[PDB]
Amino acid sequence: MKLNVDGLLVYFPYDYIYPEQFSYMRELKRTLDAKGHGVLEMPSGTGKTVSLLALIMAYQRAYPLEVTKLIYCSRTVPEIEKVIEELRKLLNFYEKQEGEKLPFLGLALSSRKNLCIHPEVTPLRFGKDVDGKCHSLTASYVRAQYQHDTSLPHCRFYEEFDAHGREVPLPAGIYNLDDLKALGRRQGWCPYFLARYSILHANVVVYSYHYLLDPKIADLVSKELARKAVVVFDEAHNIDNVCIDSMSVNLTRRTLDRCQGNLETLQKTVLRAEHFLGFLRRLLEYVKWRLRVQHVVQESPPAFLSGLAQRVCIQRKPLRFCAERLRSLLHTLEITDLADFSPLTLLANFATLVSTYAKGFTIIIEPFDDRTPTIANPILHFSCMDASLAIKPVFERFQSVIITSGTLSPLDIYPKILDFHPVTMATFTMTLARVCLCPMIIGRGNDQVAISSKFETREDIAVIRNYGNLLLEMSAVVPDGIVAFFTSYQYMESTVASWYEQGILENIQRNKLLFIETQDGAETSVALEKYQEACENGRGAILLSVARGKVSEGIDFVHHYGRAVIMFGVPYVYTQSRILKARLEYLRDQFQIRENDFLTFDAMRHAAQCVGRAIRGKTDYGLMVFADKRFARGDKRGKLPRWIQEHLTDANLNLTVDEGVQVAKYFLRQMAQPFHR
Amino acid sequence: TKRWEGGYERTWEILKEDESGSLKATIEDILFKAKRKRVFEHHGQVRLGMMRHLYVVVDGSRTMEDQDLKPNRLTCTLKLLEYFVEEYFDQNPISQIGIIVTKSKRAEKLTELSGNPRKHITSLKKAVDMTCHGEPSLYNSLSIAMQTLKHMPGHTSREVLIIFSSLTTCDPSNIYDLIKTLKAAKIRVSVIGLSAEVRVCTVLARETGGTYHVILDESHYKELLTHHVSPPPASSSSECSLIRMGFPQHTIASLSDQDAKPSFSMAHLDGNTEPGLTLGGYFCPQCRAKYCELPVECKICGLTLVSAPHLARSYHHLFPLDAFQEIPLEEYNGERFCYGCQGELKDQHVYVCAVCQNVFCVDCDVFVHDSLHCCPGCIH
DNA sequence: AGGTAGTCACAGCTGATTGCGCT
DNA sequence: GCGCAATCAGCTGTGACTACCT
Ligand code: SF4
Ligand SMILES: [Zn+2]
Ligand SMILES: [Zn+2]
Ligand SMILES: [Zn+2]
């Protein structure tokens, strides 16, 4: 309906508005009037997007000059499509409640693989070759030679769009990615090119994080779109982590082998300007020198270029001209396809980065590999350490950047992890007619022995027996599926092997089916499918996985799937690889971040992220248990999101297994009753 | 604003005086206001009914050993099932109850589908001391119930009640195909769980048109069973439903007469105990078979033996008694003696029937509308 | 010739100290 | 070495028992 905020009226598709949504709208309006950044935290995956879009539309209607462009960067494609359809529903509601259209355009952006119409490039599953084939089919030289009408296979969507799609605009009508593809195929135009031509004359547009955090494409996709713009990174509780992936690269034997294989072909094509032809030839030997050197670790981000200029005597300046070479020299060479050429581009980017960005980075070499530690595997990592570098460009170009997700419990660490000036410090806890979740921390077992997953007690028989007993007698009270998370794959497999050795895993087997998540994508998908089908009927199942796995965030356990989520010990990231410790030292000497505090923050963030996916929707309910006495400590409970703290009473913070089972039984029995709206 | 934040209610303002002593008369009206506190309907709900072939499925897994309900789930469940059977046969004259027990991934038909109340109670009492082993199998019990109820006539309402204690079931085949088959067969399935809500039970109840409930405590268990006691509503006229049933007269045998022939009861002959060799009992109108209990379907000729008063007890719902016209005593010009109780009419209001135009006091009107269900004047 | 501030028991609270835990 | 939880000191409420002046 029409919500009347202190200076505006906003239409909302749903007549009923929860108090949390109203408070969130008030806070967001306050932030927009404050013309500053901020961070938000909500406990509901759904209902946030509709409120955000409604308030954005209301603010644009009230202040067209203050806000011109809106960005809703998300994590993956399902989020993009669901927010697109939510925006479509909002626009339909506005049209049905008002009666006249408005000149608002909404489009979704993705990779060229997602948005393409050629049947000769869709079937392949090479994300690094679609762009190369697209560039080969249509480019500046293609347009130049189209004047003579050369008889060669090439894309023709642009050859029609440039003469027919650059004149007619799209003032109204929000289009989804499939809608854009349909429009392009019916008009004979490329969806990507029309999207590029239409972002300038557009109201809202959504895409993924990689189009803003990666500087190589953010500038091209957003340079002078809007000085005064609003961007939001929903579900970005691990944003800093992916920020590291923005400026982290790895080198292996395959990359250098591919480079040495393709440089011969490049030289053969050339002999059919010289400032880089001879420059590139001797670049590989300097980095292959470390291959023959058997050393543990070398750290010299500033002195690496010094070693480069001592071994080969090259100035630092021409490295800065490598990047501009990519758009200049390569287009003269007429590369048939970017395949067997990506390692050269990534090496050039790495050289440019180390020449330019070396103040808050670190070069690491690791002679270690999984199950083949020291045979042949020197891995070079230009690992990033400060998340501010990946976040400065968006903070200096936008006015009200908002970071929101389902788990942002410490609001004082993000503003100091990366350069930020929050003005919000706001948390929201969902409320319903009844308590939909019953978090509890189970400490010592029936033997009055702690079940903490300490490194010195990982192989202890007593804690393994207690975990097995908890999983057994818990599986008989909560039906249709339990999702259990372990610290790591090694610990998980050792624990299940120990359970198999004893006559305890068989007892769990007859209650629920046991499913194990592995690194294989197809195996994980089929295991998830069989778990879902087993939970559909009354058989019930247990899904055992790891907190730091692709299955932790790739799926959401909707109601009746995973009524119970079990955390076996505090999930702590491994301190090896000399990657975590470098970040700890950088945070200590730069941001004055305690190492123990950061480790606890990361562990509790992962635990909350993997435990908060059991509550999707108001009608949904679930159980959340932590099988570690360390969770009972205040410094770790304080790291849980506010919407879980108030439901975690002090009565059950160190209760044993039997009382936890009784609490679970009582909660499920009282939650099985019908409720109202 | 709020309702209680306005003006304070003064309930004592109702009483008034005009002659310094009239208050008594006012309280007399209060006494007249005291009566007629009912809606003149002992039930006030469903005015008809339909025959039911109900099957009760009882879990026999280890979960029945839980002590949530003292002493354990099985004992309280069987006690409440005996109560439910008694009440169900009390409120349904021509219905039938079958009992299936699920145990060790198998289903055993503990009692055949019949209308005898005593047999089911004895079977439950025998099953009180059963051994709980294995895990329940909803698929087998539902398959057996569907197989037995498939051939029942369409006019009968086919119902299956499942008391699911364990939270897990073993299905030898896909259960959703069985659910679709039940939906095509028009079978109502209702589940009353004990521990927590299960997805399969909810889906089954939703698709088959039944109701799924979860027990909070023993009182809630009894309330759910009582709710299941009530027959489902039936259409005004559905089909050609008629059933051939006899009415055995309870002829006892006395040695004074020469027609005293002792005979063993057919039902008692099937028991392990020595059959009762009584003087007489109920004789089948078709084959003159002797029975001791009613209503019991005849084993020989297949005829159903039903007691006429049980059927006739529900006839007042077919012909409800119309409310009498309330008339003040002053406005009625006639005799001032009640037609029913012969008492003098002194109340402010006199009720007159619309048919026989007889006068009944408040007590007689309430008695006729509540218990008698027939106007004494209209009888003549 | 007849009645209330100390005193005792058993609980509560808050204001510090004060030994215990460490991927 | 730091941080969280266990512990005690001091004050107070509640109810009842007891030793010197109108
Ligand atoms: S120009 Fe567009 S349609 Fe043609 S290959 Fe590239 S992405 Fe596909
Ligand atoms: Zn007979
Ligand atoms: Zn009378
Ligand atoms: Zn009458």
Coordinates of C-alpha atoms in Angstrom, one line a residue, chain B:
Chain B
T1 CA -7.6 4.8 20.6
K2 CA -8.6 1.8 22.8
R3 CA -11.9 0.4 24.0
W4 CA -10.9 0.6 27.7
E5 CA -9.4 4.1 27.6
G6 CA -12.8 5.7 27.1
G7 CA -15.6 5.8 29.6
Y8 CA -15.8 3.4 32.5
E9 CA -18.8 1.0 32.2
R10 CA -21.4 1.3 35.0
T11 CA -23.2 -2.1 34.8
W12 CA -25.3 -1.2 38.0
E13 CA -27.1 1.5 36.0
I14 CA -29.5 -1.1 34.6
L15 CA -31.6 -1.5 37.8
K16 CA -34.2 1.3 38.4
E17 CA -36.9 2.1 40.9
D18 CA -40.2 4.0 40.5
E19 CA -42.4 2.8 43.4
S20 CA -39.6 2.2 46.1
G21 CA -39.9 -1.5 45.9
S22 CA -40.2 -2.4 42.2
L23 CA -36.6 -3.7 42.1
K24 CA -37.8 -7.2 42.9
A25 CA -39.9 -7.3 39.6
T26 CA -36.7 -6.4 37.7
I27 CA -34.8 -9.3 39.1
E28 CA -37.7 -11.5 38.2
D29 CA -37.0 -10.6 34.5
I30 CA -33.3 -11.5 35.3
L31 CA -34.6 -14.9 36.4
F32 CA -36.5 -15.2 33.2
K33 CA -33.3 -14.0 31.5
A34 CA -31.4 -16.8 33.4
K35 CA -33.2 -19.6 31.5
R36 CA -33.1 -20.2 27.8
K37 CA -29.3 -20.2 27.9
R38 CA -29.1 -23.0 25.2
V39 CA -29.7 -22.9 21.4
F40 CA -32.3 -25.6 21.7
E41 CA -29.9 -28.1 20.1
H42 CA -27.8 -30.7 21.9
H43 CA -25.4 -30.9 19.0
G44 CA -26.1 -27.9 16.7
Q45 CA -23.7 -29.2 14.0
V46 CA -24.1 -31.8 11.3
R47 CA -27.8 -32.8 10.9
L48 CA -27.1 -36.0 8.8
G49 CA -24.4 -38.6 8.3
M50 CA -22.9 -41.2 6.0
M51 CA -21.5 -44.7 6.5
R52 CA -17.8 -45.0 7.1
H53 CA -15.3 -47.8 6.7
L54 CA -12.5 -46.5 8.9
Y55 CA -9.1 -48.1 9.2
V56 CA -6.8 -47.3 12.2
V57 CA -3.1 -47.9 11.5
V58 CA -1.0 -48.3 14.7
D59 CA 2.8 -47.9 14.7
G60 CA 4.7 -50.7 16.3
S61 CA 8.3 -49.5 16.1
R62 CA 10.8 -48.8 18.8
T63 CA 9.5 -45.1 19.0
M64 CA 6.4 -46.4 20.7
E65 CA 8.7 -47.2 23.7
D66 CA 9.1 -43.5 24.4
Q67 CA 7.7 -42.3 27.7
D68 CA 6.3 -39.0 26.5
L69 CA 2.8 -40.2 27.5
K70 CA 2.8 -42.3 30.7
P71 CA 3.6 -45.0 30.8
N72 CA 4.6 -45.2 27.1
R73 CA 3.1 -44.1 23.8
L74 CA 1.7 -47.5 23.0
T75 CA -0.4 -47.9 26.2
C76 CA -1.9 -44.4 26.0
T77 CA -2.5 -44.8 22.3
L78 CA -4.3 -48.1 22.8
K79 CA -6.4 -46.7 25.7
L80 CA -7.5 -43.7 23.6
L81 CA -8.1 -46.0 20.7
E82 CA -10.5 -48.1 22.8
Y83 CA -12.3 -44.9 23.9
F84 CA -12.4 -43.8 20.2
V85 CA -13.9 -47.1 19.1
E86 CA -16.5 -47.0 21.8
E87 CA -17.5 -43.4 21.0
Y88 CA -17.4 -44.0 17.2
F89 CA -19.7 -47.0 17.4
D90 CA -21.9 -45.0 19.7
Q91 CA -22.2 -42.2 17.2
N92 CA -22.3 -44.3 14.0
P93 CA -24.8 -47.2 13.8
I94 CA -23.8 -48.8 10.5
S95 CA -20.1 -48.0 10.4
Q96 CA -17.1 -50.4 10.4
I97 CA -13.7 -50.3 11.9
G98 CA -10.6 -52.2 10.9
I99 CA -7.2 -52.2 12.6
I100 CA -3.8 -52.6 11.0
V101 CA -0.5 -52.7 12.9
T102 CA 2.7 -51.6 11.1
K103 CA 5.9 -53.2 12.4
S104 CA 9.3 -54.3 11.0
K105 CA 8.7 -52.7 7.6
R106 CA 5.5 -54.8 7.3
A107 CA 1.8 -54.4 7.9
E108 CA -0.4 -57.0 9.7
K109 CA -4.2 -56.8 9.6
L110 CA -4.9 -57.2 13.3
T111 CA -8.7 -57.1 13.0
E112 CA -10.9 -57.5 9.9
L113 CA -13.2 -54.7 8.9
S114 CA -16.4 -55.2 10.9
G115 CA -19.0 -53.4 13.0
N116 CA -18.5 -55.4 16.3
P117 CA -17.3 -53.1 19.1
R118 CA -16.4 -55.8 21.6
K119 CA -14.0 -57.7 19.2
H120 CA -11.9 -54.6 18.5
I121 CA -11.6 -53.7 22.2
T122 CA -10.5 -57.3 23.0
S123 CA -8.0 -57.2 20.1
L124 CA -6.5 -53.9 21.3
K125 CA -6.3 -55.3 24.9
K126 CA -4.4 -58.3 23.6
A127 CA -2.2 -56.1 21.5
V128 CA -1.3 -54.0 24.6
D129 CA 1.5 -56.5 25.4
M130 CA 2.9 -56.7 21.9
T131 CA 6.6 -56.4 21.1
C132 CA 7.7 -53.1 19.4
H133 CA 10.4 -53.9 16.8
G134 CA 11.6 -52.6 13.5
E135 CA 10.4 -49.5 11.8
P136 CA 6.9 -48.6 10.4
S137 CA 6.1 -48.9 6.7
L138 CA 3.3 -46.5 5.6
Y139 CA 3.4 -48.0 2.1
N140 CA 2.4 -51.5 3.1
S141 CA -0.4 -50.3 5.5
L142 CA -1.8 -47.9 2.9
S143 CA -1.6 -50.6 0.2
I144 CA -3.5 -53.1 2.4
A145 CA -6.2 -50.5 3.3
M146 CA -6.6 -49.5 -0.3
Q147 CA -6.9 -53.1 -1.4
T148 CA -9.6 -53.9 1.1
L149 CA -11.5 -50.6 0.6
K150 CA -11.2 -50.7 -3.2
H151 CA -14.3 -52.9 -3.6
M152 CA -16.5 -51.0 -1.1
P153 CA -19.5 -49.3 -2.6
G154 CA -19.1 -45.7 -3.7
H155 CA -21.7 -44.2 -1.4
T156 CA -19.7 -45.3 1.7
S157 CA -17.1 -42.9 2.8
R158 CA -13.7 -44.7 2.8
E159 CA -11.5 -43.3 5.6
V160 CA -8.0 -44.3 6.8
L161 CA -6.6 -43.1 10.1
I162 CA -2.9 -43.4 10.7
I163 CA -1.3 -43.0 14.2
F164 CA 2.3 -42.3 13.1
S165 CA 4.7 -42.3 16.1
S166 CA 8.0 -42.9 14.3
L167 CA 9.4 -40.1 12.2
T168 CA 10.8 -42.4 9.5
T169 CA 9.1 -44.8 7.1
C170 CA 10.6 -47.5 4.8
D171 CA 8.9 -47.4 1.3
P172 CA 9.6 -50.4 -1.0
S173 CA 8.3 -48.3 -3.9
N174 CA 7.5 -44.7 -4.6
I175 CA 4.8 -43.5 -2.3
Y176 CA 3.6 -40.5 -4.4
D177 CA 2.3 -43.0 -7.0
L178 CA 0.3 -44.6 -4.2
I179 CA -0.9 -41.2 -3.1
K180 CA -2.2 -40.5 -6.6
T181 CA -3.8 -43.9 -6.7
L182 CA -5.6 -43.1 -3.4
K183 CA -6.7 -39.8 -4.8
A184 CA -8.1 -41.5 -7.9
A185 CA -9.8 -44.0 -5.6
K186 CA -11.4 -41.3 -3.4
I187 CA -10.0 -42.4 0.0
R188 CA -9.7 -39.9 2.9
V189 CA -6.5 -40.3 4.9
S190 CA -5.9 -38.5 8.1
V191 CA -2.7 -38.7 10.2
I192 CA -2.2 -37.9 13.9
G193 CA 1.5 -37.8 14.6
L194 CA 3.2 -37.9 18.0
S195 CA 6.7 -36.5 17.7
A196 CA 6.8 -33.8 15.0
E197 CA 5.5 -32.8 11.6
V198 CA 6.6 -35.0 8.7
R199 CA 6.5 -33.8 5.1
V200 CA 5.2 -37.1 3.6
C201 CA 2.2 -37.2 6.1
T202 CA 1.4 -33.5 5.3
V203 CA 1.5 -34.1 1.6
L204 CA -0.6 -37.3 1.9
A205 CA -3.3 -35.5 4.0
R206 CA -3.4 -32.5 1.8
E207 CA -3.7 -34.5 -1.5
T208 CA -6.2 -37.1 -0.2
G209 CA -8.4 -34.4 1.4
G210 CA -7.7 -35.5 5.0
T211 CA -6.4 -33.6 8.0
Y212 CA -2.9 -33.9 9.5
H213 CA -2.4 -33.1 13.2
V214 CA 0.4 -33.3 15.7
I215 CA -0.1 -34.3 19.4
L216 CA 0.7 -31.7 22.0
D217 CA -0.3 -33.8 25.0
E218 CA -2.7 -36.6 26.0
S219 CA -5.6 -34.1 26.3
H220 CA -4.9 -32.8 22.8
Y221 CA -4.7 -36.5 21.6
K222 CA -8.2 -37.1 23.0
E223 CA -9.5 -33.9 21.5
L224 CA -8.2 -34.9 18.0
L225 CA -9.7 -38.4 18.3
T226 CA -13.0 -36.8 19.4
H227 CA -12.9 -34.5 16.4
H228 CA -12.3 -37.6 14.2
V229 CA -15.3 -39.2 15.8
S230 CA -17.8 -36.9 14.1
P231 CA -19.0 -38.3 10.7
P232 CA -18.3 -36.2 7.6
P233 CA -21.1 -34.3 6.0
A234 CA -23.1 -36.0 3.2
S235 CA -25.0 -34.7 0.2
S236 CA -28.7 -34.4 0.2
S237 CA -29.1 -37.2 -2.3
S238 CA -26.1 -38.9 -3.7
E239 CA -26.9 -42.3 -5.1
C240 CA -29.2 -45.4 -4.8
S241 CA -27.6 -46.5 -1.5
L242 CA -29.6 -49.2 0.2
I243 CA -28.4 -52.2 2.2
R244 CA -30.3 -55.4 3.1
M245 CA -30.2 -55.8 6.9
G246 CA -32.3 -57.7 9.4
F247 CA -33.7 -56.9 12.8
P248 CA -33.3 -59.8 15.2
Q249 CA -35.7 -60.0 18.1
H250 CA -34.1 -60.8 21.5
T251 CA -36.0 -64.0 22.2
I252 CA -34.9 -65.6 25.5
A253 CA -35.6 -69.2 26.3
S254 CA -37.6 -70.4 29.4
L255 CA -38.1 -73.9 30.6
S256 CA -41.8 -73.1 31.2
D257 CA -42.3 -73.1 27.4
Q258 CA -41.6 -76.1 25.3
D259 CA -39.8 -74.0 22.6
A260 CA -36.6 -73.6 24.8
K261 CA -33.8 -74.9 22.6
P262 CA -30.3 -74.2 23.9
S263 CA -27.8 -73.3 21.2
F264 CA -24.2 -72.2 20.9
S265 CA -23.6 -68.7 19.6
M266 CA -22.0 -68.5 16.1
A267 CA -19.7 -65.7 17.2
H268 CA -18.7 -67.5 20.4
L269 CA -17.9 -70.7 18.4
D270 CA -15.1 -68.9 16.6
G271 CA -13.3 -67.9 19.9
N272 CA -10.5 -69.9 21.5
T273 CA -12.5 -69.9 24.8
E274 CA -15.4 -72.3 25.4
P275 CA -18.5 -70.9 23.5
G276 CA -21.3 -69.7 25.7
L277 CA -24.1 -72.3 25.9
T278 CA -26.8 -69.8 26.9
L279 CA -30.6 -70.3 26.9
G280 CA -31.1 -68.0 24.0
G281 CA -30.2 -64.7 22.3
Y282 CA -30.6 -62.9 18.9
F283 CA -31.9 -65.1 16.1
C284 CA -31.1 -64.2 12.5
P285 CA -34.4 -63.5 10.5
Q286 CA -32.9 -65.3 7.5
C287 CA -31.1 -68.4 8.7
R288 CA -32.1 -68.4 12.4
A289 CA -28.4 -68.2 13.5
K290 CA -27.9 -67.4 17.2
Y291 CA -25.8 -64.4 18.2
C292 CA -25.2 -62.6 21.5
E293 CA -23.9 -59.2 20.4
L294 CA -25.4 -56.4 18.2
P295 CA -24.8 -55.0 15.7
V296 CA -23.0 -58.1 14.3
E297 CA -23.1 -59.1 10.6
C298 CA -24.3 -62.7 10.2
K299 CA -21.5 -65.1 9.4
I300 CA -23.7 -67.6 7.5
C301 CA -26.0 -65.7 5.2
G302 CA -24.1 -62.4 5.2
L303 CA -27.0 -60.4 6.4
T304 CA -26.4 -57.4 8.8
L305 CA -28.2 -57.5 12.1
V306 CA -28.9 -54.1 13.5
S307 CA -30.9 -53.0 16.5
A308 CA -33.8 -50.8 15.6
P309 CA -33.5 -48.3 18.5
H310 CA -30.0 -47.5 17.5
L311 CA -31.2 -46.5 14.0
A312 CA -34.2 -44.7 15.4
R313 CA -32.2 -42.6 17.9
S314 CA -31.1 -40.2 15.2
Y315 CA -34.5 -39.7 13.6
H316 CA -35.1 -36.4 15.5
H317 CA -32.5 -34.7 13.3
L318 CA -34.5 -35.6 10.2
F319 CA -37.6 -33.8 11.7
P320 CA -36.4 -31.0 14.0
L321 CA -39.1 -29.5 16.3
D322 CA -40.1 -26.0 15.2
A323 CA -39.6 -23.2 17.8
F324 CA -42.8 -22.2 19.6
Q325 CA -44.1 -18.7 19.3
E326 CA -43.2 -16.7 22.5
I327 CA -46.4 -14.8 23.6
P328 CA -46.8 -12.6 26.6
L329 CA -49.3 -13.8 29.2
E330 CA -51.4 -10.7 29.0
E331 CA -51.8 -10.8 25.2
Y332 CA -53.0 -14.5 25.3
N333 CA -56.7 -14.9 25.7
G334 CA -57.3 -18.5 26.8
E335 CA -56.7 -21.1 29.5
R336 CA -53.9 -20.3 31.9
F337 CA -52.9 -23.9 32.6
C338 CA -49.9 -25.5 30.8
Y339 CA -50.9 -28.2 28.3
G340 CA -47.9 -30.4 29.2
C341 CA -47.3 -30.1 32.9
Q342 CA -50.8 -28.9 33.9
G343 CA -49.2 -26.2 35.9
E344 CA -50.6 -22.7 36.3
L345 CA -49.1 -20.2 33.9
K346 CA -47.6 -17.3 35.9
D347 CA -44.5 -16.4 33.8
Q348 CA -44.5 -13.2 31.8
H349 CA -44.2 -15.2 28.5
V350 CA -46.3 -18.2 27.3
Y351 CA -45.2 -20.4 24.4
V352 CA -47.8 -21.6 21.9
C353 CA -47.2 -24.3 19.3
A354 CA -47.9 -23.3 15.7
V355 CA -49.7 -26.5 14.8
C356 CA -51.9 -27.6 17.8
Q357 CA -52.1 -24.1 19.4
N358 CA -51.4 -25.5 22.8
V359 CA -49.7 -23.5 25.6
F360 CA -46.5 -24.6 27.2
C361 CA -44.6 -22.9 30.0
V362 CA -40.8 -22.2 29.9
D363 CA -39.9 -25.5 31.5
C364 CA -42.1 -27.5 29.2
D365 CA -40.9 -25.6 26.1
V366 CA -37.2 -26.2 27.1
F367 CA -37.9 -29.9 27.8
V368 CA -39.7 -30.4 24.5
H369 CA -37.0 -28.6 22.5
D370 CA -34.1 -30.3 24.3
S371 CA -35.0 -33.9 25.1
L372 CA -38.5 -34.9 24.0
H373 CA -38.0 -33.4 20.5
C374 CA -41.7 -33.9 19.8
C375 CA -44.7 -31.7 20.6
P376 CA -47.1 -33.6 22.9
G377 CA -50.0 -31.7 21.5
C378 CA -49.1 -32.6 17.9
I379 CA -48.9 -36.3 18.9
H380 CA -52.6 -36.5 19.5

